[PDB]
Write a protein that binds this DNA or RNA. Sequence first.
RNA 1: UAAGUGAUCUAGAAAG
Lengths: 302, 67, 67, 81, 67
Amino acid sequence: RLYTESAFYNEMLENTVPEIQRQNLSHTILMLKAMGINDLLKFDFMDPPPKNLMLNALTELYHLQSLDDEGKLTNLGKEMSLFPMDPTLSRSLLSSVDNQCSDEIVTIISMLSVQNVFYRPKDRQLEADSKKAKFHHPYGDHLTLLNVYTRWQQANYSEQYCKTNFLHFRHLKRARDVKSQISMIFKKIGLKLISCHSDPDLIRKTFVSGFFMNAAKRDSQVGYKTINGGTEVGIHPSSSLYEYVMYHSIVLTSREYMSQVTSIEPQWLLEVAPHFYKAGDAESQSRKKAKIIPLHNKFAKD
Amino acid sequence: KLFPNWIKPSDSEIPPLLVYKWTQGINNLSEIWDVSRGQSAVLLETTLGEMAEKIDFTLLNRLLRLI
Amino acid sequence: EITPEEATTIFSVMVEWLESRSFSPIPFPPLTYKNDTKILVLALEDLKDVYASKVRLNASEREELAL
Amino acid sequence: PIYVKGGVWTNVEDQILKAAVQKYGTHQWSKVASLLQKKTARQSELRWNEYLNPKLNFTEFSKEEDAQLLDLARELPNQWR
Amino acid sequence: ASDLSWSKQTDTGITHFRAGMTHEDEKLIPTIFRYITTWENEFLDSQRVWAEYATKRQEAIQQNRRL
RNA sequence: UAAGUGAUCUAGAAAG
């Protein structure tokens, strides 16, 4: 042990920690509400989470419309609780028939339920990046996920095709099995499964519909600024964009990044989530609040 | 695209650069140097004297109200 | 100095020109712009360019700087 | 405290300026400015020209005068000087 | 300093060099003109380097990298 | 039938 006996006996914590103190509680609150727990603060956990984590997750569920402002389940929150899913993904997926691209969204969701399928060896970056560019949709990492899965299921597939295109077969195989299991639930609950002849706007609108709080805007000083909390963030290296994006993931290292990014028209953000993109909710008038004000005025009303 | 290419000073090119470009243009005209078939070139430099110094505001105003 | 006929002719010409261009006019600038701030920053910079060199400044100059 | 000049014309200040003008005349605007601790030379001169000079007038315009005005507007577009 | 009376009529090849800014104990002070890239060179050069840039930009696009 | 001859201004004192 590369530390003292005293450090072992006195300075190391006994246990990590239980999983409850290391989570977001968005799924946990929706489960507790569906179980009939009104008072979440006084739920008898063996180790209670920080109260702020519970409060933030109640606020997110109210924005998603799963709870009301008095903290009770809506029809949407009751239907959401029937799915064994994150809420943003489940909500994007349920609504996807209304936007005529349920088949594509069922693919995108299954791909987002597995790890990054693109292999990039440290000494073989250029060949790996070139193979990824076969499937890459510019300004559309979520569409890139649709394209790889569609190729992976193509008749033109061969035994070692995943190795020769720098793709992780285990993750794509898992995404297939997830897609089939998801599709069986769509059939069981009457969702309607549908698609469009040709439309990336609908896929983007569906993705916005779940992930409208995980949005960021291009800005001169910060690179990108998040809609929630006003965080300075870069695009994570894995993506180079050709002014608004939705992100799947916030990556914290020595700098803040956002990873797995798809461009979105910000009119669609106002249309799909008008309660959240209410300009009153934005403090003062920083870059985001300022850019939302022209979009409402100069690019929408007139 | 208000101001057409032909207006010089504002082009984002340096006055010597501008001059050079002009020269190039002159050269690159199709069969410009021929003197065979009575071909005759003329270059006309002139200054628009008091171009700003007699702009009437009335007319100017109306003109601007176009743009 | 301008004969009204001349003015009319001029107007006709300019109108004809923009007609040929499909030149949409410049609006009165609202609160819409993403560039607004950027635009402002240019003008200020330009103005500052006068004042960065000369350290001793007049009253008017001082006022301008303050602004 | 030293500072950049401007502000608003208090009546006393205006009176002082008038007095100065009587004294030093309409082309020594520096001196008059100096006499006013708040207001500049340029400011002062402008004020004199615009508001304070008695050979101006602020009486209302007759109907004929109104006509003349609006006609001028129609004909000279916003060249208000 | 070529033949002033002839030079007025036609351009001469420079024949006679006058001494400009002279001095006793003449250490050959270099001019400034030699240390500034003469415009034509600058412009041909510009054309080259910008062409190169263009080509590499295309390469970057093809390769999908930041140049 | 294939090199280098030569033209070389100034110039410091007072008071402001």
